[PDB]
Design an enzyme around this catalytic site. Structure first.
Site, short mmCIF file in Angstrom:
data_model
loop_
_atom_site.label_atom_id
_atom_site.label_comp_id
_atom_site.label_asym_id
_atom_site.label_seq_id
_atom_site.Cartn_x
_atom_site.Cartn_y
_atom_site.Cartn_z
N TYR A 134 49.88 49.89 38.95
CA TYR A 134 50.18 50.06 40.11
C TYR A 134 50.81 51.29 40.19
O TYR A 134 51.64 51.48 39.51
CB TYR A 134 51.08 48.98 40.79
N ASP B 20 54.26 46.76 50.16
CA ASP B 20 54.83 46.53 48.92
C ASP B 20 54.48 47.69 47.91
O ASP B 20 53.58 48.07 47.74
CB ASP B 20 54.84 45.26 48.52
N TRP C 110 45.50 43.49 50.73
CA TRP C 110 46.28 42.60 51.59
C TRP C 110 45.97 43.14 52.95
O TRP C 110 45.69 44.54 52.77
CB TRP C 110 47.58 42.18 51.10
N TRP D 144 47.10 44.56 44.46
CA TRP D 144 45.87 44.80 44.99
C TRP D 144 45.27 45.81 44.26
O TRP D 144 44.70 46.84 44.82
CB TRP D 144 45.84 45.03 46.39
N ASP E 156 45.68 49.59 46.83
CA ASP E 156 46.31 50.36 45.72
C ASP E 156 45.67 51.41 44.92
O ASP E 156 44.45 51.39 45.10
CB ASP E 156 47.04 49.30 45.07
N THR F 69 50.60 52.39 47.01
CA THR F 69 49.79 52.06 48.16
C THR F 69 49.32 52.85 49.32
O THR F 69 50.13 53.66 49.71
CB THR F 69 50.46 50.79 48.77
#
Ligand code: HEC
Ligand code: HEC
Ligand SMILES: [Cu+2]
Ligand SMILES: [Cu+2]
Lengths: 373, 147, 105, 125, 373, 125, 105, 147
Positions: free
Chosen positions: F113, F26, F51, F102, F70, F116
């Site tokens: 963020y 995501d 995750w 994360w 992340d 990722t």
């Protein structure tokens, strides 16, 4: 890119190698490094993309506050910006500051508060905050309550003082302690400071009439003491400051008589670029009504800076808003389309598009290259 | 309007107070009959005019009548509207305004007043459009004053 | 503080008092750029042109705080009564090349 | 429309970038985020300071002076974005320059740009 | 809108009236007021649009920080959010806070710091910060370092304390001092606090097996003590908390057997809405592979909440990501398309589109309505 | 493609949302803003916490465990945005949940963020 | 501080010392959730599954600062030597429902 | 492998130390010849088994062998791999492991050991797949333990 790092990635695996993540470092600054700034249409927080114009790869980014002024040292030892942030996003207590960043790690080196929030909040004009050529001092413009330029010591990392200046705008530094401004009256002012009370200020003569309108984005090559300054018609004024004093060179016309007869005029944001080694001028142009000067333009004219001889006319194919060039022997013509949020990188010689880097914020408008050595 | 009245008020200007020492000229005769001041832009006049101005007027209005203690005299806004014309500018000088801007007949001959007016008119920085006091040929060679 | 603000909204030109101390603002300037007045006088500025203009004294001139005055539009006025003697410098907030000074003696 | 063609004002729709009072507007039409033509949205601060323009009103054939005051103290609205530059001049002529954030004089020193309003401040034909 | 305020504006002028600008006030809160939140795809600063769903007019906005949790009092006396800001845009010192806003002026009423930055930063889940039904207390979830819910006194404007909770998620308050959480094990926990040491905590039984997956956006009507909680298949669990204790009502199936045979499943963000007066369920659905549950969906099913009787199936025509409804007698079905950044407002009875409000940030995802009285 | 159709992974282009190691990503592909497949861009902080997902690698036919860590301390990149949810479970199952940021464990408590990364942490067929 | 960190990187499982004090992490849990050891012992956790896991003591437990340990991946280990006596509680950073305790007596 | 060895080491388990008091049964005979424990899931056995467990094992392994002083015995990870089987689980109890988990032949008859094993096997929370110790019909009626 993908395919390349996929056959890489994939095979890394068929050879057994598992991944130990780390934070990368940006490749050392070269002449093909190009900076795109996205003012994001006056949003309160903004981004600057660090791109390798050769490979057409974003290689880093930096975050900033409301309407910042990016600055790149020509020799590649740092990049900085003066910026504005607020305790509650867009309201609250204001903090104006300069941050200096290392250009390999992108980590901040200094963070210097500017007292009493004095930055001028304008659509971004590259020459409203400027480095002196030794790189130890940053000067920025204050418009209200009275014209002034502040002096930031980037070496002992501190704000020094504000200089009272007359009704003049933009800062073109020619030495550790001197810079020029263009005044309301049509003159250039020379400001010498280090004269620790008030600076010593001199005007040149008026060089353009009241009804000749010079743009907000002049090109200035500080290593050549050369100021290329277009007007709404594409007449190009050029001033040479390499002696320490303003010498007014001859005004070239950038558009042919037939183009001005057919309604061609410059339009865009960063409408002009000057390659110093080849000594050439690139201007963004198209056919427009008189007062549609801030709109994108589809062509590029190239002319000899000495003669006014038109060398080429590129048909860009996209709607470009700003241009600039790398300052090396075989240069790239960087064309940025705010509407496409894409950077097209063309051959400056032929105008042939070579690469594009899209998805460059919400409203990207300014390109900055370092003239290296 | 018939010609000469004090601009704030005592209305008719009284010309029996003027010095006889200079009311004789073709300029003063021409202006008193027509309201037109022949000294405007007269290259002949203009060096005396500039000195008449500096002695008597720059104290309050500044060097180029751009303003200091009292108002600027160099653009198209006139606190008293009549001063767009030489009849009104004359009426301000003869008659006086308020304050420390008093009547000027006791220091200046009528022909010296029209010479000073022409320096005021020369110091104008607007453009020949509201230079209604100038004839077409005088407008045609008129240049907005530059210090 | 060294000035009282009499009406804090611009009021109209044709309501300025009979023979008042007046600075006209026209052709992008303060037409009487160095006014002298006495302790106790009220200055009224009146903007004679369409272009809106104001008077703005910065912090430490009239008081602790800066007084940005109201924008005047054509034929509006705005007054200030100086209660201490001194040279008070001002400019126009949107147009800081427009300047003036009141000298109160 | 072609962005480069001449401005043809209309007097039928105020959220449109060609609505006649918007001939030198930079930024975002306040009416699109809770304001009107002449008033700031809830929560924003009104600046006193402005750039101006003279806009031809195609309905009654007169040019009017528009004072483009900003509503400030909020991040940009992101709705009804227009840039018109009719009679707009470089930053060294600040009274007709529209890349400047005209938020001066707004309460609590509010300086972020939310949107621009378009009040008429007088006639100028 | 335009035309309307233009013939207004224009004629205002032909009648002579000049403009005296002011800051407007939002019309008093009604049942047609709808709130859209734009998380902006995890950007560090976000917007909430206040819309009048009847007229289809944005009537105000609010700014917030990183990934905030919007809350609206049902009775319309305030709106609030818990938010995160940083001293240098996205890095620096963190401040987590709650701000309370008046709903007519949009001005902040309280700004309360939450110590030690305890908010949980997740894609926005409306039930992870919740008002107790008297409106004097806000409770928010903390995931790390250990499950906990903090208690904010909105009346004396202060943070009170953190409550240790078991491995349970979402906060559904049923009284001034009680709320329910849904736990990892499949049970609901009841938490009663004001028990000033540790709260008193009770589990219900396990109500769904380990392999039944309940969504992150359950609908909760606090005035009806009703929790409607779908699963990835559209099976709808409903729990009634109106007694103070969890009573498990019968699980209805939202999709027909033929739709499940043909591959219909729910998909979206805020996939469910519950009208309390009509007691009905609206679910976003389309044909999808099993694991494409977060994608937009093009239909809406309506069913009776008591019987599971399918009342209607709307063909929305756009790709919708979230839905919600006004809570009045003749309600609107609010359909938000993150990809269109547009809010379509349909008749909930007929599914007929009535209005749309576009240009609603960069990534709008959450709709919030107040159940008024 | 149709967003609702099944995921068909590819192993030819890492910036594409269907590149096989991105089945429960995501946010934004780090490689699009100065990172690689497995490393953060200059200036961002690396989280330790993640995750995970099991992604089928169409080339060698094995499923692998991807740990979606992340890179944090920056505003989002805004480039190469993908959301894939293969085998993604609700927040009450946090180890397979991907709407959570994360960023835990990243230096200086960095929590915004940026993007990722997609390192492989082991096989899981 | 009450624990020394012996290797700050996970090292491999098959290098854990002959007959060491070991907590296995498998099936989303700390298989010996209440270990007792003596002052001076070294505990080694070893993660037996693919799912990465770590040990994280919060602030005020081992020291002034929280110790978030390194993520271990399958068959990696990580040790800590407790130098003061006490009950030290820990959880797993991505998975805070995974908990344990070392009791040092 | 041939059958019974100490799991850490002294290898062959020595059955001459076992009590004679319970080595007689069909369960112990069947298991010693085949390695199969007939008490698994035996509803008959399971109430004694649970009490054997509580008296001797819950102190260290907890009530539902979920773990306390010593490790959990309730899932598919076994520190000693052999314990996936009844031969290995038996070898851990007869023989002992390390520490405070010593040999159990001096407190438990062989048939009491297989009854306790079956309670350990009943406390399993994984799923019948790694329930290799169960036959198909025993898997078919096996339910993951719920406290
Ligand atoms: C200082 C003591 C002054 C001297 C000497 C002169 N002027 Fe003046 N002038 C002064 C003041 C304070 C005023 C304002 C009077 C009022 O009633 O408002 C003026 C005004 C004028 C005007 C009118 C300006 C207008 O805009 O209409 C004119 C034309 C004028 N003064 C001309 C002028 C000339 C040419 C002088 C030298 C002969 C002169 N002034 C002297 C103060 C003083
Ligand atoms: C506390 C003093 C204990 C008693 C009584 C029992 N066990 Fe135990 N057990 C204990 C420890 C500390 C250990 C670890 C030994 C080692 O070498 O690691 C164990 C281990 C076991 C095992 C092995 C676990 C594995 O994962 O393979 C089993 C099967 C076991 N213990 C079973 C068990 C039973 C059934 C008991 C009652 C008869 C029993 N244990 C008692 C500590 C203690
Ligand atoms: Cu002004
Ligand atoms: Cu874990």
């Amino acid at each position: 890119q993908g395919q390349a790092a996929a056959r890489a990635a994939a095979a890394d695996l068929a050879a057994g190698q598992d991944d130990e993540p780390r934070i990368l470092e940006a490749p050392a600054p070269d002449a093909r490094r190009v900076y795109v700034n996205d003012p994001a249409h006056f949003a309160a927080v903004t981004q600057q993309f660090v791109i390798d114009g050769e490979a057409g790869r974003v290689i880093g980014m930096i975050d900033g506050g409301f309407l910042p002024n990016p600055v790149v040292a020509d020799d590649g030892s740092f990049i900085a910006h003066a910026s504005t942030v607020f305790s509650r996003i867009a309201r609250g207590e204001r903090t104006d500051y300069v941050e200096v960043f290392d250009p390999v790690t992108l980590l901040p080196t200094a963070d210097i508060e500017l007292p009493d929030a004095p930055r001028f909040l304008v659509g971004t004009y590259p020459w409203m905050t400027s480095l002196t050529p030794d790189g130890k001092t940053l000067l920025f413009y204050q418009f209200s309550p009275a014209p002034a330029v502040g002096v930031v010591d980037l070496e002992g990392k501190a704000f020094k003082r504000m200089l009272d200046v007359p009704d003049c705008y933009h800062i073109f530094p020619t030495a550790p302690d001197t810079f020029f401004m263009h005044c309301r009256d049509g003159s250039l002012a020379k400001v010498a400071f280090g004269t620790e009370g008030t600076p010593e200020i001199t005007h040149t003569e008026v060089f353009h009439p009241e009804d000749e309108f010079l743009i907000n984005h002049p090109a200035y090559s500080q290593k050549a003491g050369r100021l290329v300054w277009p007007t709404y018609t594409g007449k190009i004024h050029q001033i040479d400051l390499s002696s320490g004093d303003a010498k007014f060179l001859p005004a070239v016309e950038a558009l042919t008589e037939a183009e001005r007869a057919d309604g061609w005029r410059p339009g865009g944001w960063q409408q002009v670029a000057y390659h110093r080694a080849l000594d050439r001028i690139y201007l963004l142009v198209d056919q427009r009504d008189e007062w549609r000067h801030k709109t994108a333009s589809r062509f590029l004219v190239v002319l000899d800076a000495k003669t006014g001889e038109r060398l080429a006319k590129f048909e860009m194919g996209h709607e470009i808003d700003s241009i600039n060039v790398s300052q090396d022997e075989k240069p790239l013509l960087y064309a940025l389309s705010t509407g496409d949020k894409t950077l097209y990188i063309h051959d400056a010689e032929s105008g042939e598009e070579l690469r594009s880097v899209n998805q460059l914020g919400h409203g990207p408008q300014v390109i900055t290259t370092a003239d290296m050595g | 309007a018939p010609q000469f009245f004090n601009i704030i008020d005592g209305s008719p200007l009284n010309f029996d107070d003027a010095m006889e020492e200079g009311r004789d000229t073709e300029a003063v005769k021409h202006f008193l009959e027509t309201g037109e001041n022949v000294y405007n832009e007269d290259p002949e006049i203009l060096p005396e005019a500039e000195e008449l101005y500096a002695g008597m007027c720059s104290g309050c209005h500044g060097h180029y009548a751009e303003g200091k203690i009292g108002p600027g005299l160099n653009d198209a806004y006139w606190t008293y509207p009549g001063n767009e014309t030489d009849v009104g500018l004359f009426s301000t000088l003869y008659g006086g305004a308020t304050g420390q801007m008093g009547p000027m007949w006791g220091s200046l001959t009528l022909d010296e007043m029209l010479r000073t007016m022409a320096w005021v008119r020369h110091l104008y920085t607007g453009d020949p459009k509201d230079a209604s006091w100038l004839t077409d040929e005088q407008k045609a060679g008129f240049t907005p004053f530059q210090p | 503080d060294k000035a009282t603000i009499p009406s804090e909204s611009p009021f109209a030109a044709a309501e300025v008092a009979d023979g008042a101390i007046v600075v006209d603002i026209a052709k992008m300037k303060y037409e009487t750029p160095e006014l002298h007045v006495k302790v106790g006088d009220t200055v009224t500025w009146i903007n004679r042109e369409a272009m809106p203009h104001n008077v703005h004294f910065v912090a430490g001139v009239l008081g602790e705080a800066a007084l940005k005055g109201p924008m005047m539009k054509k034929e509006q006025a705005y007054s200030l009564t100086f209660t201490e003697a001194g040279t008070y410098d001002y400019h126009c907030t949107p147009h800081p090349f427009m300047r003036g000074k009141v000298v109160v003696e | 429309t072609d962005p480069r063609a001449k401005w043809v004002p209309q007097d039928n729709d105020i959220q449109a970038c060609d609505y006649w009072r918007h001939c030198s507007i930079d930024g975002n039409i306040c009416d699109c985020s809770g304001g009107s033509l002449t008033n700031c949205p809830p929560g924003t601060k009104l600046a006193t300071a402005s750039w101006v323009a003279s806009c031809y009103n195609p309905t009654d054939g007169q040019s009017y002076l528009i004072a483009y005051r900003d509503c400030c103290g909020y991040n940009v609205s992101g709705r009804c974005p227009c840039l018109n530059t009719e009679g707009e001049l470089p930053v060294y002529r600040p009274e007709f320059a529209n890349d400047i954030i005209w938020c001066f004089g707004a309460e609590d020193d509010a300086m972020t740009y939310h949107c621009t309003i378009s009040p008429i401040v007088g006639k100028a034909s």
